[PDB]
mmCIF file of C-alpha atoms (C1' of nucleotides) in Angstrom:
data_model
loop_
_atom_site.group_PDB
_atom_site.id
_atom_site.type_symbol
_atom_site.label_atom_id
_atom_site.label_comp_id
_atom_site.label_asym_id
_atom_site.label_seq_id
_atom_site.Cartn_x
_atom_site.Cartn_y
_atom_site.Cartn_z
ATOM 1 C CA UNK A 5 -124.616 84.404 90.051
ATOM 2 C CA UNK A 6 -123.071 80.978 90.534
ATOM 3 C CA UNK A 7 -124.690 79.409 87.292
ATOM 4 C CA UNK A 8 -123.564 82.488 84.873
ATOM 5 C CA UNK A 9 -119.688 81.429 86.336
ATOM 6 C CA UNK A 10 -120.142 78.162 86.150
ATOM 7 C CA UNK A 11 -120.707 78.698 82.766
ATOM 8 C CA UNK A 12 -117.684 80.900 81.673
ATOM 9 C CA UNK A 13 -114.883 79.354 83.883
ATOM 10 C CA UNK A 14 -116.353 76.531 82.098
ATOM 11 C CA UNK A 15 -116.460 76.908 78.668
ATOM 12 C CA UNK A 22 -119.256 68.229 80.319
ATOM 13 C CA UNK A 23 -121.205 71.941 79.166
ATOM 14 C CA UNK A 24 -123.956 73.174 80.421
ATOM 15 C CA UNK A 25 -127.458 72.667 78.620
ATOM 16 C CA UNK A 26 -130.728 74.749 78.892
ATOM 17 C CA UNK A 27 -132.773 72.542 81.280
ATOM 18 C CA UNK A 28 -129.849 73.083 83.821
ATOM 19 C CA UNK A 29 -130.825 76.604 83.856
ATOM 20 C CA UNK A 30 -134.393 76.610 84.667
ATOM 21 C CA UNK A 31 -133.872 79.077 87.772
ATOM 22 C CA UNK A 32 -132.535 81.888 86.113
ATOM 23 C CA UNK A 33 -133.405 82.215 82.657
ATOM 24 C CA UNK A 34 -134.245 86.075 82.470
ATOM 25 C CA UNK A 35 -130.922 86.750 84.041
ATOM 26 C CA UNK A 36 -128.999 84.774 81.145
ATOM 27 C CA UNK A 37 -130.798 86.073 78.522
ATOM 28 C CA UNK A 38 -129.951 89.857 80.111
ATOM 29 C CA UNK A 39 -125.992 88.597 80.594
ATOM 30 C CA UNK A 40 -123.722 88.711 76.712
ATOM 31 C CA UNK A 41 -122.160 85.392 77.558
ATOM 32 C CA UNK A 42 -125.135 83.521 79.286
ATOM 33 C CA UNK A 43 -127.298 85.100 75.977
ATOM 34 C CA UNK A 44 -125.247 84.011 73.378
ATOM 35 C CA UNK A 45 -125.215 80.599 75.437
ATOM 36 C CA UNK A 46 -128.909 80.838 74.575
ATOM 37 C CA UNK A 47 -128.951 81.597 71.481
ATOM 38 C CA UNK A 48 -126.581 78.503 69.963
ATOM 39 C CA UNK A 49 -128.469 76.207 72.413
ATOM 40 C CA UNK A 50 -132.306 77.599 70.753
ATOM 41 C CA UNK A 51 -130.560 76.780 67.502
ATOM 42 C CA UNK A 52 -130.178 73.099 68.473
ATOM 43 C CA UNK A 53 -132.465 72.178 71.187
ATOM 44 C CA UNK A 54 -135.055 70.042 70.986
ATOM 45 C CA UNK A 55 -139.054 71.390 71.843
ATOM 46 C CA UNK A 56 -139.644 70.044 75.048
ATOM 47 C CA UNK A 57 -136.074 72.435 76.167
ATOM 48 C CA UNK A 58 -137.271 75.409 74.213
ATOM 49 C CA UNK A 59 -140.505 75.626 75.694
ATOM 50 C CA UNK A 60 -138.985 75.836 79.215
ATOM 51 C CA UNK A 61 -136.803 78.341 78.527
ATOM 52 C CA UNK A 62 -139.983 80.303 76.771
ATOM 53 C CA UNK A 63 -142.595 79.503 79.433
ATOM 54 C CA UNK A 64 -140.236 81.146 81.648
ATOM 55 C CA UNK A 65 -139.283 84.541 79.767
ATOM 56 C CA UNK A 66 -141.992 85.209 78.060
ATOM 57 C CA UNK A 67 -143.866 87.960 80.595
ATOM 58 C CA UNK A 68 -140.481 89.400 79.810
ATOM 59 C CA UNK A 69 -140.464 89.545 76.131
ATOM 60 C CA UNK A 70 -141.336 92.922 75.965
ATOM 61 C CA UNK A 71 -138.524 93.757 78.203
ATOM 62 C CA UNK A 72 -136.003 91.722 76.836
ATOM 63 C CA UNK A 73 -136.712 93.082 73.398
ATOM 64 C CA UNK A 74 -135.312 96.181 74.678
ATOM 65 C CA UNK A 75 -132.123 94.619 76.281
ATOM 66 C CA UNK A 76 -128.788 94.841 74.396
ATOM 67 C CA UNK A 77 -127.868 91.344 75.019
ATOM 68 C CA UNK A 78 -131.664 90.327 75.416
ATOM 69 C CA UNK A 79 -132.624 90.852 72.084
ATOM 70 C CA UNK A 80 -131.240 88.125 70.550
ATOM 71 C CA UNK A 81 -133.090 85.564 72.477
ATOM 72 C CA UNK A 82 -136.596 87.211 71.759
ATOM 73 C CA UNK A 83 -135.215 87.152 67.737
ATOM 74 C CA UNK A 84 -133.882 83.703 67.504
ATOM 75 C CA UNK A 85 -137.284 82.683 69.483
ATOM 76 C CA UNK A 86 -139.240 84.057 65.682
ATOM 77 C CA UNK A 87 -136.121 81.985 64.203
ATOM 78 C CA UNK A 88 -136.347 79.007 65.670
ATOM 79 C CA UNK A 89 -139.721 79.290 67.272
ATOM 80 C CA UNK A 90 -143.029 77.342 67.331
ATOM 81 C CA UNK A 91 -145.997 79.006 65.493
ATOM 82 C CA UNK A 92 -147.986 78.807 69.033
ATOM 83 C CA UNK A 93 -144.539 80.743 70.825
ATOM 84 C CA UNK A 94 -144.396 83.337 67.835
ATOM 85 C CA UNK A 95 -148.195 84.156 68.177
ATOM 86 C CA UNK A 96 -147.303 84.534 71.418
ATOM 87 C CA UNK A 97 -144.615 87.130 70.672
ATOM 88 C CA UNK A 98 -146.917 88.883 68.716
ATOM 89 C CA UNK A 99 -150.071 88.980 70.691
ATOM 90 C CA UNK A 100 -147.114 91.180 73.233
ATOM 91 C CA UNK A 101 -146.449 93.587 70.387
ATOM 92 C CA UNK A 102 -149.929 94.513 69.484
ATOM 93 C CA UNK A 103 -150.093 97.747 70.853
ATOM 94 C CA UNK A 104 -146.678 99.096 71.247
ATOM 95 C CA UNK A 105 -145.348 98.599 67.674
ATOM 96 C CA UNK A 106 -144.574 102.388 67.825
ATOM 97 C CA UNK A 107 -142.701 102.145 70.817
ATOM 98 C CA UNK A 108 -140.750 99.071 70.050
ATOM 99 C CA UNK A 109 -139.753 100.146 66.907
ATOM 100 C CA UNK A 110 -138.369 103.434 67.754
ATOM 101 C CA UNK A 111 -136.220 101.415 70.193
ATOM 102 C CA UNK A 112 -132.439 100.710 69.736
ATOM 103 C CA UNK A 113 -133.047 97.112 70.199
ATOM 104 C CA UNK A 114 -136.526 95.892 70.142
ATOM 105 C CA UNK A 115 -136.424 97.513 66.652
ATOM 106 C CA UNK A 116 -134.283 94.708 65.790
ATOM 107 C CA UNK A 117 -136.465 92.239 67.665
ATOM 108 C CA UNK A 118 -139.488 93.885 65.210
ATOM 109 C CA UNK A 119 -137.324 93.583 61.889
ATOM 110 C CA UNK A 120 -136.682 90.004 62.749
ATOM 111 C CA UNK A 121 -140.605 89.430 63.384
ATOM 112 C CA UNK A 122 -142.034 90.717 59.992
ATOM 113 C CA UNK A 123 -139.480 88.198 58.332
ATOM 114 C CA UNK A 124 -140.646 85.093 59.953
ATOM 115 C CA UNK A 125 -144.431 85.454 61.137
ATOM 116 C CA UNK A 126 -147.745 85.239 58.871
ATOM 117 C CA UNK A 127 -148.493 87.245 55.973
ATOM 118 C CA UNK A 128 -151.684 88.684 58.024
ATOM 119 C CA UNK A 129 -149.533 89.366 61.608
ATOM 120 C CA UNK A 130 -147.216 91.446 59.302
ATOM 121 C CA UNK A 131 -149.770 94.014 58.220
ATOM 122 C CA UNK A 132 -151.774 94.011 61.388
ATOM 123 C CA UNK A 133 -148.699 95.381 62.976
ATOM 124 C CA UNK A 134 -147.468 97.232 60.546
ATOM 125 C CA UNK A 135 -150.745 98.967 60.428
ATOM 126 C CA UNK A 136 -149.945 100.700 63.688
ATOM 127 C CA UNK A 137 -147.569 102.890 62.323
ATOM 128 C CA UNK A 138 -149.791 104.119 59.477
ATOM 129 C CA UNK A 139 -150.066 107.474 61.351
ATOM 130 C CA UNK A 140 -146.633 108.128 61.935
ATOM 131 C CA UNK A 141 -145.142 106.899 58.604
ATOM 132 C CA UNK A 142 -142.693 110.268 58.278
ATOM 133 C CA UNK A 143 -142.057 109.823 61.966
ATOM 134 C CA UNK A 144 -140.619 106.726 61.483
ATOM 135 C CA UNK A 145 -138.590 107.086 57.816
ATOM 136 C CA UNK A 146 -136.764 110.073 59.764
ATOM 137 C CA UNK A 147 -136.010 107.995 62.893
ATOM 138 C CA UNK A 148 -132.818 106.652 63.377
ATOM 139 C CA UNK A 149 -134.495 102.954 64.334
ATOM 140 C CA UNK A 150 -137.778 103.491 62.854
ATOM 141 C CA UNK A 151 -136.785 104.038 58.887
ATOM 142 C CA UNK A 152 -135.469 100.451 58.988
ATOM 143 C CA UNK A 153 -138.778 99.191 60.076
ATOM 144 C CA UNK A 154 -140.307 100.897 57.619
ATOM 145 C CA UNK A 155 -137.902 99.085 55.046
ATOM 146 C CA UNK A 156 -138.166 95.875 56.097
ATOM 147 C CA UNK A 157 -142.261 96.425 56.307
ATOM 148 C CA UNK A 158 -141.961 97.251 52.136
ATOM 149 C CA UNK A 159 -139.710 94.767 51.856
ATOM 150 C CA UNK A 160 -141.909 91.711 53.457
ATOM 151 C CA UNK A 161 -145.596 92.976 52.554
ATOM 152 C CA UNK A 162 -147.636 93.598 49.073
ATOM 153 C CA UNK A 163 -147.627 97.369 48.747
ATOM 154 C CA UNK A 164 -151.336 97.179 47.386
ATOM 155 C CA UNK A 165 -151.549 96.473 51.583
ATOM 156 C CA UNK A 166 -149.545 99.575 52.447
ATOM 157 C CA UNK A 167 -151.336 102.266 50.735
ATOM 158 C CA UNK A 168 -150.691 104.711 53.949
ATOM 159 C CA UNK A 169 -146.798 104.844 52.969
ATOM 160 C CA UNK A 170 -147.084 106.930 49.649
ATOM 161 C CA UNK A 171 -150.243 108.724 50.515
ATOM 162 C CA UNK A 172 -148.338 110.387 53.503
ATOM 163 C CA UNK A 173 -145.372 111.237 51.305
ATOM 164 C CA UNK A 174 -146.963 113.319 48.930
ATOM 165 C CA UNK A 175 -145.530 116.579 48.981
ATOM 166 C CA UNK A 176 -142.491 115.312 51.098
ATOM 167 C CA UNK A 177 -141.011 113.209 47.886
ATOM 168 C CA UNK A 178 -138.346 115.612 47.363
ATOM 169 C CA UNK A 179 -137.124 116.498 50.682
ATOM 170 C CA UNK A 180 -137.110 112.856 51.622
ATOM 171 C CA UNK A 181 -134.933 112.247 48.343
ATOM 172 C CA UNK A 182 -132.337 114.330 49.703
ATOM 173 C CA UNK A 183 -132.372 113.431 53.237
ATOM 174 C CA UNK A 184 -130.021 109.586 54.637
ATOM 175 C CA UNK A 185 -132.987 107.587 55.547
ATOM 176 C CA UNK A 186 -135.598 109.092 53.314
ATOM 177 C CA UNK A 187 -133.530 107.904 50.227
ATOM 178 C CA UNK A 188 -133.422 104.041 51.342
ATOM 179 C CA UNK A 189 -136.985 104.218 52.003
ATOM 180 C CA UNK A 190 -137.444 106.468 48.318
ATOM 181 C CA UNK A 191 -135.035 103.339 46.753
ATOM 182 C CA UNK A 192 -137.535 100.714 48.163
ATOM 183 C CA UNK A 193 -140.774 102.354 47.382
ATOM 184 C CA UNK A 194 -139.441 102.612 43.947
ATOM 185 C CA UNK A 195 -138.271 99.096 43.880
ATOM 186 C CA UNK A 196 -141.181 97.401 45.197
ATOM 187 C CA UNK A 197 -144.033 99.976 44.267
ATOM 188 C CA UNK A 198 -146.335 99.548 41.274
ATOM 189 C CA UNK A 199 -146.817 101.387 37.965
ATOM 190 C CA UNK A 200 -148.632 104.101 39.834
ATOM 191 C CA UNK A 201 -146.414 104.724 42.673
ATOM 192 C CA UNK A 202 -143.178 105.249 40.943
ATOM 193 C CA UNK A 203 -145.081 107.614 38.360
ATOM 194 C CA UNK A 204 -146.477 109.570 41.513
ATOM 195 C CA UNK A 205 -142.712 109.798 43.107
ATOM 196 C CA UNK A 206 -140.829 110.228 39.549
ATOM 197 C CA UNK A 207 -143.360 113.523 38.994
ATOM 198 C CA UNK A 208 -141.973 115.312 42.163
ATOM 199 C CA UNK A 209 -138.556 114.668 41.010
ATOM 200 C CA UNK A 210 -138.580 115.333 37.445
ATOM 201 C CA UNK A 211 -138.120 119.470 37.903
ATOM 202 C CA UNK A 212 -135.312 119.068 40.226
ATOM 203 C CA UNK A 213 -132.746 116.309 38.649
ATOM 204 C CA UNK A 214 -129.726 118.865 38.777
ATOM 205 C CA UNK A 215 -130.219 119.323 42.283
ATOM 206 C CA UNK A 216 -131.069 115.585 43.116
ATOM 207 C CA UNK A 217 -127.870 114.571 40.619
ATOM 208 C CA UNK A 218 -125.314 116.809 42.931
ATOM 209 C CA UNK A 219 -126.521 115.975 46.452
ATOM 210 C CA UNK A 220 -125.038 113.792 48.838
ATOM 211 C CA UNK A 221 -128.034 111.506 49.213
ATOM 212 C CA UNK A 222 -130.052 112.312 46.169
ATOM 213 C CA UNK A 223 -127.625 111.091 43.782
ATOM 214 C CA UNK A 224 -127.769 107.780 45.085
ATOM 215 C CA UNK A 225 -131.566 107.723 43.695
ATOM 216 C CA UNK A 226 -130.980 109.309 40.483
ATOM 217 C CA UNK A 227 -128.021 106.283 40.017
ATOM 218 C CA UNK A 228 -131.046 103.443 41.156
ATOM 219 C CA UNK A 229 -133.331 104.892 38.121
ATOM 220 C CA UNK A 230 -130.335 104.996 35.573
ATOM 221 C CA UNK A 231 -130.107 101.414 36.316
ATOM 222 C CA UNK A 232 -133.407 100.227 35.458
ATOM 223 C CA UNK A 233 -134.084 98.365 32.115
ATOM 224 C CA UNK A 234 -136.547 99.432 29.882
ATOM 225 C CA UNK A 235 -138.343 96.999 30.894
ATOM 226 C CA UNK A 236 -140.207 99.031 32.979
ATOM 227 C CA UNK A 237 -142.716 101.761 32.889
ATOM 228 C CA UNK A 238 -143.313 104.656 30.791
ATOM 229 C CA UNK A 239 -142.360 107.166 33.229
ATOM 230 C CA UNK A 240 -139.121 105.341 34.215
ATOM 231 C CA UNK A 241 -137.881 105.510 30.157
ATOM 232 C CA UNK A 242 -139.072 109.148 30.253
ATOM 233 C CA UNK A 243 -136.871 110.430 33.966
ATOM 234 C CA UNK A 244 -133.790 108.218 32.255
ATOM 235 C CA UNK A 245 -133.663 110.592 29.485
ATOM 236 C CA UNK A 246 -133.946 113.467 31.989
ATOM 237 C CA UNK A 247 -131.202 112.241 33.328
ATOM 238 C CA UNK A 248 -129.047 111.475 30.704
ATOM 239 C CA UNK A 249 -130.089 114.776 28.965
ATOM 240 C CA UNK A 250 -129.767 116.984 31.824
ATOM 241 C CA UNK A 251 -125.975 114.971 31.806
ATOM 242 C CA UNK A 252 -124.752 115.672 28.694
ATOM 243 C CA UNK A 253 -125.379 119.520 29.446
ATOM 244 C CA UNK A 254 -123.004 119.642 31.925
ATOM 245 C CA UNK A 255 -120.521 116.958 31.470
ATOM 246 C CA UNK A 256 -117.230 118.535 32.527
ATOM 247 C CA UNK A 257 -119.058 120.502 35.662
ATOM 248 C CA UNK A 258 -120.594 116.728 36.827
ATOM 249 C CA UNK A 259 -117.589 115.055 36.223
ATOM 250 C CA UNK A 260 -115.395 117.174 38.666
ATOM 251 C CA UNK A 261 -118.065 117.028 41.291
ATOM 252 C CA UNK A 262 -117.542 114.791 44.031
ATOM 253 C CA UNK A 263 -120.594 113.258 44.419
ATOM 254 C CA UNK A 264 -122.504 114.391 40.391
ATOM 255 C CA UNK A 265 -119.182 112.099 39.121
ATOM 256 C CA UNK A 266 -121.024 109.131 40.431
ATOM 257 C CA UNK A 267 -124.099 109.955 38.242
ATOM 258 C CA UNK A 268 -121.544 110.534 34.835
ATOM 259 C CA UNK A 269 -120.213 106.967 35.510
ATOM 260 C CA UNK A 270 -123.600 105.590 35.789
ATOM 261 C CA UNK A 271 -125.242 107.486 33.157
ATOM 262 C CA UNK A 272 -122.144 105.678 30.494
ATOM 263 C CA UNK A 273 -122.071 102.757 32.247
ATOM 264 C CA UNK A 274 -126.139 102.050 32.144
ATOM 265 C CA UNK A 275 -127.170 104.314 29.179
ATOM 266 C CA UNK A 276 -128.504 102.881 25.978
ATOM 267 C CA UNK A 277 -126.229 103.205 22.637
ATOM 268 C CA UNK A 278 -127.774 106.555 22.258
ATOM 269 C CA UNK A 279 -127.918 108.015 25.472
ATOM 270 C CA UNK A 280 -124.161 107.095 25.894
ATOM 271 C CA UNK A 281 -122.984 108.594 22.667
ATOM 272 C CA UNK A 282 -124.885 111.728 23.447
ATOM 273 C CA UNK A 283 -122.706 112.135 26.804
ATOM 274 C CA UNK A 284 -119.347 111.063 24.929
ATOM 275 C CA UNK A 285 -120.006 113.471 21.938
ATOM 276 C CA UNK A 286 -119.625 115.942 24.717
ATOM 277 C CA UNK A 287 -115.998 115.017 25.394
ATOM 278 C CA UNK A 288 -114.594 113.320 22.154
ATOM 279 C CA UNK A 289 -111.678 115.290 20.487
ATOM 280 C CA UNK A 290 -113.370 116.225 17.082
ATOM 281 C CA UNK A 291 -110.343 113.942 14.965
ATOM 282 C CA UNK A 292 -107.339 112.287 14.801
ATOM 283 C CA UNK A 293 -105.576 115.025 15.239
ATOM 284 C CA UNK A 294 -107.151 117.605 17.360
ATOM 285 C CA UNK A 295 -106.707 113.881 19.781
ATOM 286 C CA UNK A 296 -102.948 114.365 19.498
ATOM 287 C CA UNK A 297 -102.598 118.143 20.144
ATOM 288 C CA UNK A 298 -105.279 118.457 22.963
ATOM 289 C CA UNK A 299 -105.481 122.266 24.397
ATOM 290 C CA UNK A 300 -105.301 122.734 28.504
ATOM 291 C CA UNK A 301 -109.353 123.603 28.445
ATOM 292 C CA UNK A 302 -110.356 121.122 26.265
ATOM 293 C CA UNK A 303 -112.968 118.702 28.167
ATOM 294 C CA UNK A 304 -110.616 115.657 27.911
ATOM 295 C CA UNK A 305 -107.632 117.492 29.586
ATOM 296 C CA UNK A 306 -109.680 119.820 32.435
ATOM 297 C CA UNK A 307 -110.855 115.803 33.204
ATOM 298 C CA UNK A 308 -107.971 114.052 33.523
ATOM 299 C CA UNK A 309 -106.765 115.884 35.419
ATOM 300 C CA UNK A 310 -109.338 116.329 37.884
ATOM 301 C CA UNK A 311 -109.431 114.226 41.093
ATOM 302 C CA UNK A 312 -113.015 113.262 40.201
ATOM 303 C CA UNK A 313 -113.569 113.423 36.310
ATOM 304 C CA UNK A 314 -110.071 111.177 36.085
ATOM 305 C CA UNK A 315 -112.936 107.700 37.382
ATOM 306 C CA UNK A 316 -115.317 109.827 34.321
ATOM 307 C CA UNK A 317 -112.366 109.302 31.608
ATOM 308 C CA UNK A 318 -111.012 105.511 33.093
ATOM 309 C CA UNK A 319 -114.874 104.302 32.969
ATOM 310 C CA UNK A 320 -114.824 105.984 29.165
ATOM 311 C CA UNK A 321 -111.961 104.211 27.882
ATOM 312 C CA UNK A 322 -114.249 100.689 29.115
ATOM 313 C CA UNK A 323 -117.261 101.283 28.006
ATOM 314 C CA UNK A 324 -116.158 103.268 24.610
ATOM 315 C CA UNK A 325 -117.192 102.039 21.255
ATOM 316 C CA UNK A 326 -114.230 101.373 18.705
ATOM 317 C CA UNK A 327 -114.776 104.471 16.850
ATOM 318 C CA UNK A 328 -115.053 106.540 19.890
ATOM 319 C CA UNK A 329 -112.309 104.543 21.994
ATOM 320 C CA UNK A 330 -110.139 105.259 19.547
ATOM 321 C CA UNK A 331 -109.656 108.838 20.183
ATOM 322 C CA UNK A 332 -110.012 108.930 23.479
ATOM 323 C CA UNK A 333 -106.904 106.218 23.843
ATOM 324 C CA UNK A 334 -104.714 108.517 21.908
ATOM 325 C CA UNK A 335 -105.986 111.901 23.611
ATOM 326 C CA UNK A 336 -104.711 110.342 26.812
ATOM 327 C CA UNK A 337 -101.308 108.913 25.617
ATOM 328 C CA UNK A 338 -100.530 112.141 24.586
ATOM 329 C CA UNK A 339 -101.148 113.916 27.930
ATOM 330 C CA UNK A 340 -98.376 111.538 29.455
ATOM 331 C CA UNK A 341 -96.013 112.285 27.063
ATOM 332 C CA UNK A 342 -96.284 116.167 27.265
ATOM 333 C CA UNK A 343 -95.886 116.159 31.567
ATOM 334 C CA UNK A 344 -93.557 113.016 31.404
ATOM 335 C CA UNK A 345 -91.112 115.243 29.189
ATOM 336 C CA UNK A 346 -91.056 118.706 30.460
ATOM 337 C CA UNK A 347 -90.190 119.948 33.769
ATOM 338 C CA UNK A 350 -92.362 118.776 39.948
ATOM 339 C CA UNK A 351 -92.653 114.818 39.547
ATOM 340 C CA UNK A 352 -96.257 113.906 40.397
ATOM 341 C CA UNK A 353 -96.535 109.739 40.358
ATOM 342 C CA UNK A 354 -100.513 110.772 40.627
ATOM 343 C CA UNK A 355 -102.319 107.937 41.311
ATOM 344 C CA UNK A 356 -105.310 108.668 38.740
ATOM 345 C CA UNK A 357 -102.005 109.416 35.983
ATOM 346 C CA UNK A 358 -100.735 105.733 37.021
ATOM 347 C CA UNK A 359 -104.253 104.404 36.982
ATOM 348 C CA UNK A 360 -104.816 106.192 33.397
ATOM 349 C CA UNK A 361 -101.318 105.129 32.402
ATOM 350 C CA UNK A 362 -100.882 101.266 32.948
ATOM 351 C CA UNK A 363 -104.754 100.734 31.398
ATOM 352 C CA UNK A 364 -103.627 101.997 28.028
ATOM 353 C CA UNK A 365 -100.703 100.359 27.876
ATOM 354 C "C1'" C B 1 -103.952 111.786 44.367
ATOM 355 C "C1'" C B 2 -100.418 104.632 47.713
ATOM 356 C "C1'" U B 3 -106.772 109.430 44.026
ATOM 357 C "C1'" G B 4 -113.556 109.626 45.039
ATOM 358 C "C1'" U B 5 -120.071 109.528 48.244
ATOM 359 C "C1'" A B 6 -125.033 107.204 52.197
ATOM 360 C "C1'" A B 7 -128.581 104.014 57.730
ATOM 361 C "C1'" A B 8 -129.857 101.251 64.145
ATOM 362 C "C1'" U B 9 -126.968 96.143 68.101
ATOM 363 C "C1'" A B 10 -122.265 92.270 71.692
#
RNA sequence: CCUGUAAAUA
């Protein structure tokens, strides 16, 4: 269409009251939408409400359009109260369908951060049949999200009650462990005791998986600030740590957690997990054996992050030995005869020199 | 080993 090119072979620019014939086919075009969207940005009312009068029937559709979407969003951004009830009045009703969309789930995500406190729930409400539908839906776990992130959980009561029994599994799958992380982060007293008590018997399986381990790393972090059960899983944690140290440490993804667990730990906690590794004395330190913890570490592709993030976060008495330990393994390889220029032996090298 | 993990748009 003849405006669209004058447009590109353009960009004495074109302005959005010059476009009053074709609005819906902009808004569906990349160029002629991001056109839109810098010009909704800056435009004055009486221009925005010309372009809206004309494409709002086709909200719903343009929510779903790739290049669409953008226009419906920046309409929440930079929209009048009167135009954003508008919007919403079209999404009562489908917020199922429109958020397991590609793009209208955007268009929804956008929504709950800019409309009223009482829109949010009423639309969020919709979904509170189909709450594990959604967290395991490639759109619809980010809508979920975004709802716990913009509303008072005391209004969402319909997330956690249709989790129960699913805590674990959801733990250990991609989106169920984002959602886990934010009912955790946002949830009261009672609803991170109710998710920490389906966890608590399976920490060495959460600790080693590929998603779980992220949420064991978000409760070593906490302060003890917080609840009673939170204090109580940390120890857990930590505990169920030191057991297995040198194991943990050489797993890929467990590693992560033995960083954490030093780097977050209280005095104790920490000392209990280094005891585990320390060379006994001075001199057991300078004549380390091949199966001694220290050693099977370093040189481990993994546990050699473990021993850098020791030599950090190591206490003076504690530091000590572990400094030496590891200034002795250079010398040992460097001497006798192939060359490896490892990176984690260069990394290990340079930061105790 | 120039060393190591997670989600839907132009």
């Amino acid at each position: 269409s003849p405006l669209l090119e004058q447009l590109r072979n353009s960009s004495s620019n074109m302005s959005l009251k010059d476009i009053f014939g074709h609005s819906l086919e902009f808004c569906k075009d990349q160029h002629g939408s991001r056109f839109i969207q810098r010009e909704l940005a800056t435009s004055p009312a009486s221009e925005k409400e010309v372009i809206f009068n004309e494409i709002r029937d086709d909200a719903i559709e343009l929510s779903n359009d790739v290049f669409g979407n953008y226009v419906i969003q920046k309409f929440f951004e930079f929209g009048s109260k009167i135009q954003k009830n508008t919007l919403v009045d079209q999404f009562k009703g489908n917020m199922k369908q429109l958020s397991l969309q590609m793009y209208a789930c955007r268009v929804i995500q956008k929504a709950l951060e800019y409309i009223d406190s009482n829109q949010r729930i009423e639309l969020v409400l919709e979904l509170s049949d189909s709450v594990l539908q959604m967290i395991k839906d490639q759109n619809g776990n980010h809508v979920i999200q975004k709802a716990i992130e913009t509303i008072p959980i005391e209004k969402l009561p319909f997330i956690l009650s249709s989790l129960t029994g699913h805590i674990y599994h959801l733990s250990t799958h991609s989106y169920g462990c984002r959602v886990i992380q934010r009912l955790l982060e946002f949830g009261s007293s009672e609803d991170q005791e109710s998710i920490l008590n389906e966890l608590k018997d399976f920490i060495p399986y959460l600790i080693q998986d590929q998603y779980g381990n992220y949420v064991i790393q978000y409760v070593l972090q906490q302060d003890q600030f917080t609840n009673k059960e939170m204090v109580d899983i940390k120890q857990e944690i930590i505990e169920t740590v030191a057991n297995n140290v040198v194991e943990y440490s050489k797993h890929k993804f467990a590693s992560n957690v033995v960083e954490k667990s030093i780097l977050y730990g209280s005095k104790n906690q920490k000392d209990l997990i280094i005891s585990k590794i320390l060379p006994r004395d001075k001199n057991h330190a300078l004549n380390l054996e091949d199966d001694s913890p220290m050693i099977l570490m370093i040189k481990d592709q993994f546990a050699n992050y473990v021993i850098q993030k020791l030599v950090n976060v190591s206490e003076g008495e504690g530091k000590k030995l572990i400094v030496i330990a590891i200034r002795a393994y250079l010398d040992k390889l460097n001497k006798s005869n192939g060359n490896r220029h490892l990176a984690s032996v260069e990394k290990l090298a340079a930061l105790v020199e």
